[PDB]
Structure formats: structure tokens, C-alpha cells
Design a protein around this ligand. Structure first.
Ligand SMILES: O=c1[nH]c(=O)c2nn[nH]c2[nH]1
Ligand SMILES: O=c1[nH]c(=O)c2nn[nH]c2[nH]1
Ligand SMILES: O=c1[nH]c(=O)c2nn[nH]c2[nH]1
Ligand SMILES: O=c1[nH]c(=O)c2nn[nH]c2[nH]1
Ligand code: NA
Ligand code: NA
Ligand code: NA
Ligand code: NA
Lengths: 295, 295, 295, 295
């Protein structure tokens, strides 16, 4: 037998950092969960019990905190690139670092109409994520994403004209509820190294904001023919607005809300045009994916 | 042996209801999870296999949907009272109904500065809850709550002056992070029945809004001496603002964020006044509770 | 306003302890999650910011580890009683301690037919729990439980003869699936203090074993008329087998598995006597409770 | 823009099936959660709102139940292959089906020493999984796995001899706790189609059993130099025992249990040779992966 692939590191490293403005007294907090996995010339730790090649996962943990102390943690695309580059430069036998960061929301509180200097609220479990792969001699590949953005529209979704055969019971509809948890990922063109990532720093937050805005507006305004058709419209717009993105991927569950026929009870009318009360279904769910790139 | 207590019913009943304004085209959605448990002269279903006394839990499920079809589902204090009253009036041998409702957030989307007529976002897993106990001949007891409101302040929390003995290692501090998930419950004076609940309908939403506002403002503005001291200030204010509340209960975890000493690495300074990077602790956590009533 | 009730302490304290037999080389591990909440003359920490009355929750955490170091951690009824008694005896102004322990399974591995000396498997998320309330001058109240015991029987469950009215759609049945997650609690007679708890130590493990065995055998062998009727049979037997128990409480969800009518597809027969494929329902679920005591 | 990749289908489809032996009265249950995602000539549903190419996800759901009715659901490698083949053969424009099955444990109860005919227990959340990719003209690729197998050994794990530099604080050790949740995947050689999968049916259960046995025995008996070294020993043995496997992949968290220094309290000794009470750490955790193949 032979080792075909190997990677190891530290997962679930929670990190908080505060920035304090001395002039204004305003504080800003960042909280993330970080995973770092390394690859390189480490096969002998597996095959020969040779620990000499292992940067201990505990040391990887220390490195994450030290790196956060000495560098900006925002945008996460930059922090992840700094962190991955550290490992491939510091250790001769480590040739790739894979950094995943999940950013948690701490949104500044408004008290009596004004922004509070040091108090924050978690408004939703929506996350902003990055996956950064730093590979020696092959540059830096960054995939940015938002996830856990849960939305619902109560009308202006349709689904008709699909294939009907002996396995089909679903009725065509011209008016249904559409609800989903949005997972959207935009993949950046390869960067040559950290200097190039630094050169594009302002584009990261702006592109996240664009992706989020296009997602919400398209969802709200599209008279949706299907999840497929609506998601493609989102992806097309993001690609149009940022030239440095190569592909956009969406993964959307279709979280079903079923009509409840109550006609058995005193002829009560609660279907079609009369539908007011619905039963949200926890499972199963549709799952629709697409990756959109450039012609 | 004898049956000392018994209750049974349906849990985890998900319900969605849409309201459609014909004039304006505006739609408003409500989504809840409902539990209804009944008590009464039902001992023989347990002791003698006498199912004749059982209102099937499936029928309880049907009743929840029918009731939501025929009645307002907001405020949840009212809906829960209607639902509980139904069971004690309809069935001679059922003498108490216990209704728990969890309300999920569907907040209207703002697109391009304006409120969208039929699109919604789940902004946070914060819930608004009610527990309604409808007991034949003893009226209606309602406990209203908010839960899952997660907040953090990065300074203006202290903790010193506590008992020190041979079990104590904690250092006194004049500046720490304070973060919690707020669970707050206000208990209404007993209502004589549904007519009385109806008479107070406007107070329910207003008191929820007050409770939330007092919680956020007090948390943000108090230079906190302890979780104990800050929570008492919250409770005192809520009681002052609504005469029909008898008690307020808070249950607050203290979600610890630890300093990280980095001095072992190149004398890096990251403690006390120099603390910038912290380690959020998943467990253990402080848990602090208090029930405040009137003198 | 006044403080009507208050308790505070440390939750989610994970503890592991190993016992090593020097003669045999056999090791035995215990893992628990512990919560300790204190009550007493502590109102002024809430009302006056007087921290002098607060045993810091961090110190409570230290005390749990020290107590586990110096005492047996099994049976958990004993450990919880030692731990609660410590707080009321050590601190003059603390008058009640409430200790909750969840015990996690680490079952010795069998390798090649023999028990391994130091390797363990988590066979299921079933837990054994205790709640111990130690109240100065009122002794020690212990509630022991098992929870998360998930079972299913594929036949020999019936449900017919229930109330039918205009809210009823459920069909009577003489053969259904019954599946539940068992939560069973037995409440001990009050103990005068630690000496009395010590005197009954062997009864704790034996009664847990009895409760578990009676639950499984009754579930498997009863031709169940309802969840109500089967659960009562369990409780009756436990009370008969241990005189020192005052009450037994069961809380059982009815986890529904629905028939799937496939007759629309080529007349396929999959209902009643022909039912082979079913759809497990995640929600809603029946919830049935009863507390059984002595005549 | 262009569609670069697309797949869609139904996730989280819960399925239960019972087999009833008429001669013996013995019943056997199977419960699974199934996901099926399709690919093919479906781009126009995304780009042109052309639903004519869409096999509705609801129909995919129906197909799963019908297929379970008409075919064995065990071993899951076979069921997944039947299910995936159905879609590529039935629909001309569908060219790949991706089937994921999670099998849940329902283990026959032993009552009074004998196996019960129709009662089952969920002994642990360990799962047996398959991923089956059926691709038109390219055969059937099957990855089988076990996951959620949680184990701990209290001694006979070491970790010393790792790289030490200015980022390192971890002390070398010759005796520690090792605990993990095992995720192990074996990838079968490509099969030409369903006839070939059928020809190997007995190997599926036998190889799962082997993988599980080798995992448990190696974990228990290895005097572990590292997670890396122990996991490689597992993989090597599985490959040796089944020629039709091409690669074995393990992904193992290192779930840390920390010593607790209690020496500050009355000189209490609880470290090194005196360590009895430990603090399980929920996070962070090491994560160690390797894929082993044939020379
Ligand atoms: O078994 C281990 N492998 C590792 O790579 C490691 N790093 N810290 N502790 C460790 N233990
Ligand atoms: O065992 C049952 N008990 C009940 O109360 C019930 N209600 N619906 N189905 C039921 N099954
Ligand atoms: O606010 C606090 N209250 C407490 O009771 C406590 N105990 N440790 N830290 C604490 N912080
Ligand atoms: O938007 C949808 N897309 C689909 O593929 C589908 N299948 N069933 N319902 C559906 N809705
Ligand atoms: Na390198
Ligand atoms: Na009544
Ligand atoms: Na005392
Ligand atoms: Na095909």
C-alpha cells in the first residue's frame, strides 16, 4: 500500500478580535471559526511513525492566534491568504495550506436611533465564508461564499410544464410559496501570491455585498418559473458585475409548504385561491444546484 | 398504583398562515410551532385501556389548523387562548389545555429602500413565545417570552469583589467582554377567560416590544457590575412599564471569552490593556437566573 | 420590585475520570456533564451590586473537579449528593444546591471475544441522569432518569376505540408501527442527608438496571392498546420492584410512520396487510406523559 | 454566461421497509435517508425557463418509494445501484444519477436471552453509508462508508518527536487519552453496470463488517505513535483483505481531553502519573486525513 493523499491540521478554532479606536472610542468586533489543513512531504508520519515531519496541530492553533494578533482579520479573503502563505513559507516540507474561515455576524446595535460604540447583536445565523488554498508554486485560489440566508416569498412563484409520466403525481401550479436557504459561492481567478491578493483587497467586501444584494433583489422581484430559472438569473448578474470572478455556484433547497385540504370539516375552503393556512414540511426537500461560468 | 398526573397531546405542529390585503396587494406571513397538551378525566386510558376518553392527538393536530383558519393567529397570546378554550369547552371531560407557541421571524424585505409586498427574510433565530394554560374554572394564565436574542458588548462589564477562598482562582477584573443569549419571560395576571384576554389584546405586542427594547438598552448602557446586577435593572424597568405583569424572569448564560497569553512568543503582548485576540469558550458557561416581582 | 427567586451557577461542565486497577491493569472511564445552581442569601448581588455574597461560578467549576478527584463519581446519585452537600455546608449563606448530572456511555469494547482493558465505545446516545436538590434542613431529593432510549416495534401495536367527532380523520387500526424515545424518571423518597444516601448506595445502579429492563421487556411484549396503556404497565412494575421510589414519570413521543398509498402507480399494493414501505414523519409527533404513584 | 455544471433532485427522503417471514413470524426492519441528484441535458430549465426537461423532484421522491417496494433495500450498494440505473435508463436526456444513502441502526432486541421477533433498538448513531454514481456509458462507481463510530482509549497512545519551533508549546507525552469519531470510506473498483454489481452482492456486507472489525481491533491494540500512524495501519489491513477495493480513506478528529492541574488547591496531585480527572474539550480539535491505495 501507499499514501495517495494526506492532509491534517486543526478544525473548529474559534477566534474573536476587537479593534479599538482611541480617538472616537468606537470598538468593532470580529468573530470567526477557522480550520487549517496542511499537505506536503509528510507521508512518513503515517507509514513509519516519523513525527519529525509533523507541525503539531496544537502549534497550528497557536499560529492562528499569533497571526490574528499581528494582521488584519478582515476581509477574510486577505486573512486566509496571509495565514496559508505563512505555512508554506515557514516550513520547507509543507507545500499546500487549506484555510477555511466562517465569519459570524456581530452587528452594531442602534440604541435610540444612534449606533452604539461597543454593543452588538447577532442578527441571524447567516455566515460569510472563505476557502483559501495556498499551493507552493501555483498561487492562491479563493472561493468566497455566503450561506444560511433564509428567505420566503408568499406568491409570484410558479411551477408548471414539467415532464409527466407514470411516476408523476405533482399538480402544476401558477401560484405557490417559495422558500430556501441560500448558499452562494463565487470563485476568484487564481492569484499569483499575497502581493496580488493585497492589490485587490477593496474588491472582496464589495463583491460580497453585490452577491448578497443581487440575491435578495432577484429573489424578491423574479416571477419565478422554477428555482432553476431564478438562480441562473442571480448568477448571471454577479458575473456581469465583477470581472475577477470566474464562476458562481448556487445550491438551493426547495423548502416545501403544503396546502391543507380542510373541506372534510364543514366544507371549509383552504386550497387554491382560498389557501391561507399551510403546513411547512421539514423533509424531504428539493435540492437544486448550478455552476455558471463565462462563455 | 395510581395515576397522579397525566397529560397528552401533539407537539411540533408547524403552522404557516398568510394574510392578503386585496386593496394594497400587501401580504403578511406568520409561522409558528405549536404544542397542545390536554388534561382531564382520562386516567382510564392509562389504567384500563379505555380509549373512549381520548381525543386523538391527530384530531388535536386537525383542530390547530382549523382554528388558525378561522381566527387571527396574532398576537400569539390571543391565538393560544382561543385554542386552549376550544378544548375545555368542546369536551366535557377535558378540564385543562396547555398551549405552547413558538413564533419564527419572517421580516419584510427592503428592496431599493422600499418594503416589499410579499418577500421576507429570517433575520435571526430569536423567537417570541407564549405558554397559555387554560384551566376550567380557574381562567387563563399566560407567560410571554423572548428567547434566542444573542448579544455581546466588548467593554463596560466588570466583575470584582466576589468571595475568595481556597476554591478560588478567578482574577478580579474591571474590563471584560460580556455576551449572553437572552431568555426573558413576563407572567400576566390571571385572566378570567377569553373575553378578558380580548379586552387586553393591544397590550401584548406593546409589552413584547417594551421588554425587547428595555433589554437591549439596559445591556448596552449599563456599566455592568455583574450579570446579576444588570439583569435586575432590566426586570425592574419592565415591571414599571406594564401594570398587568406580575413577575419577570430572566435566565442568562455567561458566554465566556478568555484572554490568550502570547508572551511566550517573542514577548507578544495580548493581555489586560493589550488584549485584542480572545478565545470564545463553548463550555462551560455561567448560568444566572432571577425572578422579580412586586413589593 | 423585589427578588422573588434567584439561582445561579455553572452549566455544561464536562468531566472525565479514569479508575486504574494496579493489580489487573484494567481501566474504567466515566464521563459526565454537570450543572450546579445555588440559592441562598444572595439577593443583594442583584439589587445592590454586592458581589461579596457571590461564590464565583468559576469557583463552582473548580469545586466540581476537586470533588471528582477526592470522591467516587459513581453512582451519580451519590456523587451529586456529595457535591450538593459541600456547598450548603461550606458556605453559611448558601442554603440550597441543585445538581444535574448527565452520564455519557463509554462501554468496554469486546475484541476477539474478550473485554478490552482500556478501550471503549459510545454505544448510543442513551443517557443516565440525576437531579439532586440539597436543601438546608430539608434533606436530599433525588430524581433519577434514563433518556434517549430509542426503540421501535413493527407490529403488535393497535389504536382503536378513540373519540370520533367532526375534528376526527384518523382511521382506527389493529396493526401499526410504534416507535418512541423513552424518558423515564423515578423519584426517591426524601433522604435525611448524606449518611442516609450512603446507606442506600447499592440500590441506585440496581434500580436503574430494573427500570431499563422493565421498559424494554414491556415495550417488546405488550400487545399495545395505546402508548398510554403500555407506559402505565411499565411504571406499575417499577414501583412494585423498589419500595424506596415514590413516583415514576414517563414522557414518550409517538414517532409516526405513515403508510404510503402507491395504488396510483400500476395498482401497486402497499397499504394495510400489504404495507411494506413507510414514510417516517419527522414532525409533528404525539407526546404522552404520566406520573404514577402509590395508592 | 453559460451553465458549466448542474444537478438537481430530492434530499432527505426518509424510507422505512419491513420484511415479514410468514413461516417463522420474524420481522426485519430497514430505515434509510436517501438523496438522489440527476444530471443530463437540462441546461434549458436554467437558461430558458424550459421545464419540459425536468423530472420533478416530487416524482424522484415517488420513484424512491416505488423502487424500495419492488426491490431489496439491502445491501445499500445494490439498492443505490438499482435506483441510479433506473433514472439513466428511463429518461433519454438524463445521463448521470448520484445516489446517497444513510442507513440508520435498528438492532434486534434481546429479551430474556432470546432475539425478539419484531422489536428493535437504536444502538448508537453510527451509520453505514453509500455514495453511488451511475454515469451513462461509464458504469457505476460506489463509495461505501461507516461514520459516527465514537471510541476512546484511556492509555496506550503517545505523541512525541514532533517538530518544535517558536510556535510550539505542546509538551511531548508517552501516555495520553485518544478519542475520535471514525469516518472510513472504501472505494470499489468501477463496475460495468448492474449485472456486475449483482455478481458481487455478498462482498458488500462482508467488507463493511471487515472494515468495522479492523477499525476497532487496530484502535484497541495499537500502541499508538500518532493518529496518523494508527489510521494507516487500519487502511493497510482493509486493502489486504478485499481485492476489489481500490482506495481506503479515513478522516479522524482528535478529540482532546486535557489534564487539570489542581496543585494550587492543597497541593492536590492530578497531572502525569497522578492524572485521574480530565476536562474534555469540545473545540478545537485535530483533524487528520489520509487516502491509502495500492502500490
Ligand atoms: O496524534 C496526533 N497527531 C498530530 O498531528 C498532533 N498534533 N498535536 N497533537 C497531535 N496528535
Ligand atoms: O397511542 C396513541 N395514543 C394517542 O393518544 C393517540 N392519538 N393519535 N394516535 C394515538 N396513538
Ligand atoms: O457576572 C458574573 N456573575 C457571576 O456570578 C460570576 N461568577 N464568575 N464570573 C461571573 N460573572
Ligand atoms: O422549482 C422547482 N424545481 C424543480 O425541479 C421541482 N421539482 N418539483 N417541484 C419543483 N420546483
Ligand atoms: Na514550503
Ligand atoms: Na371541559
Ligand atoms: Na449553608
Ligand atoms: Na439516459
Amino acid at each position: 500500500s501507499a499514501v495517495k493523499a494526506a492532509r491534517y491540521g486543526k478544525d473548529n478554532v474559534r477566534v474573536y478580535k476587537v479593534h479599538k479606536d482611541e480617538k472616537t472610542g468606537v470598538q468593532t468586533v470580529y468573530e470567526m471559526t477557522v480550520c487549517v489543513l496542511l499537505e506536503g512531504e509528510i507521508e512518513t508520519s503515517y507509514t513509519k511513525a516519523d513525527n519529525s515531519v509533523i507541525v503539531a496541530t496544537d502549534s497550528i492553533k497557536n499560529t492562528i492566534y499569533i497571526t490574528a494578533k499581528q494582521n488584519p482579520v478582515t476581509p477574510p479573503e486577505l486573512f486566509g491568504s496571509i495565514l496559508g502563505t505563512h505555512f508554506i513559507e515557514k516550513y520547507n516540507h509543507i507545500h499546500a495550506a487549506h484555510v477555511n474561515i466562517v465569519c459570524h455576524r456581530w452587528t452594531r446595535m442602534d440604541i435610540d436611533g444612534k449606533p452604539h460604540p461597543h454593543s452588538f447583536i447577532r442578527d441571524s445565523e447567516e455566515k460569510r465564508n472563505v476557502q483559501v488554498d495556498v499551493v507552493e508554486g501555483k498561487g492562491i485560489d479563493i472561493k468566497s461564499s455566503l450561506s444560511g440566508l433564509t428567505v420566503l416569498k408568499s406568491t409570484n412563484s410558479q411551477f408548471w410544464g414539467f415532464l409527466r409520466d407514470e411516476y408523476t403525481t405533482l399538480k402544476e401550479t401558477w401560484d405557490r410559496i417559495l422558500s430556501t436557504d441560500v448558499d452562494a459561492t463565487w470563485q476568484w481567478k487564481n492569484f499569483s501570491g499575497l502581493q496580488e491578493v493585497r492589490s485587490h483587497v477593496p474588491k472582496f467586501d464589495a463583491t460580497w455585498a453585490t452577491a448578497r444584494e443581487v440575491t435578495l433583489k432577484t429573489f424578491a422581484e423574479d416571477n419565478s418559473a422554477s428555482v432553476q430559472a431564478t438562480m441562473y438569473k442571480m448568477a448571471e448578474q454577479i458575473l456581469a458585475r465583477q470581472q475577477l470572478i470566474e464562476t458562481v455556484e448556487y445550491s438551493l433547497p426547495n423548502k416545501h409548504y403544503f396546502e391543507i385540504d380542510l373541506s372534510w370539516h364543514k366544507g371549509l375552503q383552504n386550497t387554491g385561491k382560498n389557501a391561507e393556512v399551510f403546513a411547512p414540511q421539514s423533509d424531504p426537500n428539493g435540492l437544486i444546484k448550478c455552476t455558471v461560468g463565462r462563455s
